Design an enzyme around this catalytic site. Structure first.
Site, PDB file in Angstrom:
ATOM      1  N   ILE A   1     -84.780  13.625 -42.817  1.00  0.00           N
ATOM      2  CA  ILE A   1     -83.916  14.718 -42.371  1.00  0.00           C
ATOM      3  C   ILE A   1     -82.442  14.359 -42.513  1.00  0.00           C
ATOM      4  O   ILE A   1     -81.571  15.211 -42.368  1.00  0.00           O
ATOM      5  CB  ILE A   1     -84.224  15.118 -40.910  1.00  0.00           C
ATOM      6  CG1 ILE A   1     -83.849  14.006 -39.928  1.00  0.00           C
ATOM      7  CG2 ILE A   1     -85.705  15.461 -40.774  1.00  0.00           C
ATOM      8  CD1 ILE A   1     -83.949  14.416 -38.463  1.00  0.00           C
ATOM      9  N   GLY A   2     -82.155  13.097 -42.802  1.00  0.00           N
ATOM     10  CA  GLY A   2     -80.784  12.718 -43.061  1.00  0.00           C
ATOM     11  C   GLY A   2     -80.560  11.271 -43.416  1.00  0.00           C
ATOM     12  O   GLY A   2     -81.462  10.437 -43.345  1.00  0.00           O
TER      13      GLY A   2
ATOM     14  N   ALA B   1     -74.215   6.874 -42.241  1.00  0.00           N
ATOM     15  CA  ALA B   1     -73.687   5.578 -42.651  1.00  0.00           C
ATOM     16  C   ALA B   1     -74.566   4.415 -42.180  1.00  0.00           C
ATOM     17  O   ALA B   1     -74.922   3.547 -42.975  1.00  0.00           O
ATOM     18  CB  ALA B   1     -72.271   5.408 -42.135  1.00  0.00           C
TER      19      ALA B   1
ATOM     20  N   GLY C   1     -77.650   4.378 -41.192  1.00  0.00           N
ATOM     21  CA  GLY C   1     -79.071   4.434 -41.503  1.00  0.00           C
ATOM     22  C   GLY C   1     -79.628   5.721 -42.089  1.00  0.00           C
ATOM     23  O   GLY C   1     -78.915   6.685 -42.379  1.00  0.00           O
ATOM     24  N   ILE C   2     -80.944   5.708 -42.250  1.00  0.00           N
ATOM     25  CA  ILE C   2     -81.715   6.814 -42.790  1.00  0.00           C
ATOM     26  C   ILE C   2     -82.460   7.411 -41.608  1.00  0.00           C
ATOM     27  O   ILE C   2     -82.895   6.668 -40.729  1.00  0.00           O
ATOM     28  CB  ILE C   2     -82.701   6.332 -43.884  1.00  0.00           C
ATOM     29  CG1 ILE C   2     -82.001   5.364 -44.853  1.00  0.00           C
ATOM     30  CG2 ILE C   2     -83.308   7.517 -44.634  1.00  0.00           C
ATOM     31  CD1 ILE C   2     -82.033   3.886 -44.427  1.00  0.00           C
ATOM     32  N   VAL C   3     -82.604   8.727 -41.560  1.00  0.00           N
ATOM     33  CA  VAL C   3     -83.230   9.353 -40.399  1.00  0.00           C
ATOM     34  C   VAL C   3     -84.398  10.247 -40.787  1.00  0.00           C
ATOM     35  O   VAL C   3     -84.299  11.057 -41.714  1.00  0.00           O
ATOM     36  CB  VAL C   3     -82.219  10.185 -39.581  1.00  0.00           C
ATOM     37  CG1 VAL C   3     -82.853  10.644 -38.279  1.00  0.00           C
ATOM     38  CG2 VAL C   3     -80.966   9.364 -39.278  1.00  0.00           C
TER      39      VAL C   3
ATOM     40  N   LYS D   1     -84.179   6.884 -36.388  1.00  0.00           N
ATOM     41  CA  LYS D   1     -83.105   6.295 -37.193  1.00  0.00           C
ATOM     42  C   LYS D   1     -83.402   4.830 -37.506  1.00  0.00           C
ATOM     43  O   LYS D   1     -83.643   4.056 -36.591  1.00  0.00           O
ATOM     44  CB  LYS D   1     -81.784   6.418 -36.431  1.00  0.00           C
ATOM     45  CG  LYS D   1     -80.541   5.855 -37.109  1.00  0.00           C
ATOM     46  CD  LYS D   1     -79.311   6.236 -36.277  1.00  0.00           C
ATOM     47  CE  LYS D   1     -78.006   5.893 -36.961  1.00  0.00           C
ATOM     48  NZ  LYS D   1     -76.906   5.754 -35.965  1.00  0.00           N
TER      49      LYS D   1
ATOM     50  N   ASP E   1     -63.102   9.347 -32.828  1.00  0.00           N
ATOM     51  CA  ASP E   1     -63.647   9.862 -34.081  1.00  0.00           C
ATOM     52  C   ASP E   1     -64.718  10.927 -33.870  1.00  0.00           C
ATOM     53  O   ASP E   1     -65.732  10.942 -34.552  1.00  0.00           O
ATOM     54  CB  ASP E   1     -64.211   8.714 -34.922  1.00  0.00           C
ATOM     55  CG  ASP E   1     -64.134   8.992 -36.416  1.00  0.00           C
ATOM     56  OD1 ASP E   1     -63.326   9.854 -36.836  1.00  0.00           O
ATOM     57  OD2 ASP E   1     -64.868   8.342 -37.180  1.00  0.00           O
TER      58      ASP E   1
HETATM   59  C1  LIG Z   1     -82.215  22.496 -44.131  1.00  0.00           C
HETATM   60  C2  LIG Z   1     -80.888  22.679 -43.426  1.00  0.00           C
HETATM   61  C3  LIG Z   1     -80.903  23.798 -42.403  1.00  0.00           C
HETATM   62  N1  LIG Z   1     -80.418  21.451 -42.869  1.00  0.00           N
HETATM   63  C4  LIG Z   1     -81.045  20.756 -41.797  1.00  0.00           C
HETATM   64  O1  LIG Z   1     -82.055  21.209 -41.296  1.00  0.00           O
HETATM   65  N2  LIG Z   1     -80.404  19.547 -41.368  1.00  0.00           N
HETATM   66  C5  LIG Z   1     -80.820  18.621 -40.331  1.00  0.00           C
HETATM   67  C6  LIG Z   1     -82.143  18.955 -39.658  1.00  0.00           C
HETATM   68  C7  LIG Z   1     -82.476  17.844 -38.689  1.00  0.00           C
HETATM   69  C8  LIG Z   1     -81.444  17.830 -37.579  1.00  0.00           C
HETATM   70  N3  LIG Z   1     -81.929  17.009 -36.496  1.00  0.00           N
HETATM   71  C9  LIG Z   1     -81.466  15.751 -36.024  1.00  0.00           C
HETATM   72  N4  LIG Z   1     -81.932  15.399 -34.782  1.00  0.00           N
HETATM   73  C10 LIG Z   1     -81.595  14.214 -34.218  1.00  0.00           C
HETATM   74  C11 LIG Z   1     -80.767  13.318 -34.901  1.00  0.00           C
HETATM   75  C12 LIG Z   1     -80.400  12.002 -34.272  1.00  0.00           C
HETATM   76  C13 LIG Z   1     -79.525  11.089 -34.988  1.00  0.00           C
HETATM   77  C14 LIG Z   1     -79.044  11.477 -36.322  1.00  0.00           C
HETATM   78  O2  LIG Z   1     -78.349  10.674 -36.876  1.00  0.00           O
HETATM   79  N5  LIG Z   1     -79.396  12.750 -36.939  1.00  0.00           N
HETATM   80  C15 LIG Z   1     -78.896  13.116 -38.233  1.00  0.00           C
HETATM   81  C16 LIG Z   1     -79.996  13.437 -39.214  1.00  0.00           C
HETATM   82  C17 LIG Z   1     -77.947  14.303 -38.112  1.00  0.00           C
HETATM   83  C18 LIG Z   1     -80.289  13.689 -36.187  1.00  0.00           C
HETATM   84  N6  LIG Z   1     -80.662  14.902 -36.713  1.00  0.00           N
HETATM   85  C19 LIG Z   1     -80.063  17.509 -38.134  1.00  0.00           C
HETATM   86  C20 LIG Z   1     -79.697  18.410 -39.311  1.00  0.00           C
END
Ligand SMILES: CC(C)NC(=O)N[C@H]1CC[C@H](Nc2ncc3ccc(=O)n(C(C)C)c3n2)CC1
Length: 349
Positions: free
Chosen positions: A26-27, A30, A32-34, A49, A145
């Site tokens: 899902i992401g 910097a 890490g990978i999530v 994460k 930040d």
């Molecule tokens: C497809 C389009 C609508 N984009 C998304 O759906 N983007 C992501 C979906 C997952 C979301 N959820 C999420 N939840 C918890 C965390 C915790 C730490 C962290 O670093 N992240 C990043 C992925 C933003 C989290 N994201 C963030 C945006």
């Protein structure tokens, strides 16, 4: 036999506890990978994460260690919480990766910002930001930040801040990734030192972008960014520049002067819902708050407490939501091996 398993996700190799199933990327920020996943034990979805070799250099190590400690002990509904922490490695010698398990949110603030937002939700997100910020300031944490990519929200408009901001020292990096500087306060841009309301500037940048749908103060470096700031808000007063160090004073006072746009010209009526009387008044209140958050001199900038009392925001006000019992220190240089152990034993509580 083994209480961990591994799967490939996008590029990385996630080795996670068996309770977490159906991983999906899902992401990738910097540090890490999530992944999103299903937690069979809690019967709910979670975000996971992965920090790879966080102790690999000073910057990473400081951040990881700080993230892990603060997130564990800090408790507030607008700050993201740790559900679980683990490493699949059994000993300090073998230790490589740290996994942070957090609540699964629906979106970035960046995503929300692009949307046409009503006043109810705009003021509600802003309220929640100010409460988070407030809590951190009470616990002796000043972010510096805050930015929309490090703030996440749910469909029900619930909002959580993801990180704890700059290190009170600060660096160097090898990874090719650009650091987002646009939401940083003038006093962070110019190296002045700061107080709590340094974080108000950032909230003003987010709020203003929610309205304008463009980044207020872009730029390749702090040079461009500074220009963008003075162009729009005008050059600051000499009382402000009596607080700059000699060299930055000279640089700033020698930039081409600008008078500055008024806030109706910066955020014109056009950008607001203004069809009903309710909306007409909320637009007026919105722009007022903006004009008090986006001021170059922190001496003249509104505080967090006074922002929470502002009419646009205080409609949400409640008892245990703005305050709760808040609380060790650490900020020092270490070698790889020393950081490795500090972090390993934070992971093994
Ligand atoms: C497809 C389009 C609508 N984009 C998304 O759906 N983007 C992501 C979906 C997952 C979301 N959820 C999420 N939840 C918890 C965390 C915790 C730490 C962290 O670093 N992240 C990043 C992925 C933003 C989290 N994201 C963030 C945006």
């Amino acid at each position: 036999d083994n209480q961990f398993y591994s799967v490939e996700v996008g590029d990385s190799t996630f080795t996670v506890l068996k309770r977490y199933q159906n991983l999906k990327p899902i992401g990738s920020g910097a540090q890490g990978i999530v992944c999103a996943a299903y937690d069979a034990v809690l019967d709910r979805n979670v975000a996971i994460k992965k920090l790879s070799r966080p102790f690999q250099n000073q910057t990473h190590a400081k951040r990881a260690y700080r993230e892990l400690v603060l997130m564990k002990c800090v408790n507030h509904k607008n700050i993201i919480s740790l559900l679980n922490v683990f490493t699949p490695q059994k000993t300090l010698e073998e230790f490589q990766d740290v996994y942070l398990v957090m609540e699964l949110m629906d979106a970035n603030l960046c995503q929300v910002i692009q949307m046409e937002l009503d006043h109810e939700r705009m003021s509600y997100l802003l309220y929640q930001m100010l409460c988070g910020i407030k809590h951190l300031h009470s616990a002796g944490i000043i972010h510096r930040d805050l930015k929309p990519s490090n703030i996440v929200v749910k469909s029900d408009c619930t909002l959580k801040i993801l990180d704890f901001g700059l290190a009170r020292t600060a660096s160097f990096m090898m990874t090719p990734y650009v650091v987002t500087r646009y939401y940083r306060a003038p006093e962070v841009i110019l190296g002045m030192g700061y107080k709590e309301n340094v974080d108000i500037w950032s909230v003003g940048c987010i709020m203003g972008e929610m309205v304008r749908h463009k980044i207020l103060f872009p730029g390749r470096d702090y040079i461009d960014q500074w220009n963008k700031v003075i162009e729009q808000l005008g050059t600051p007063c000499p009382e402000f520049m009596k607080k700059l160090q000699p060299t930055v004073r000279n640089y700033v006072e020698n930039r081409p002067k600008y008078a500055g746009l008024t806030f109706p010209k910066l955020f014109p009526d056009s950008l607001f819902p203004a069809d009903s009387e309710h909306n007409k008044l909320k637009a007026s209140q919105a722009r007022d708050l903006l004009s008090k958050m986006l001021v170059i001199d922190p001496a003249k900038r509104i505080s967090v407490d006074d922002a929470l009392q502002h009419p646009y925001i205080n409609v949400w006000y409640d008892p245990a939501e703005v305050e709760a019992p808040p609380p060790q220190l650490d900020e020092r240089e270490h070698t790889i091996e020393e950081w490795k152990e500090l972090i390993y034993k934070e992971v093994m509580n």
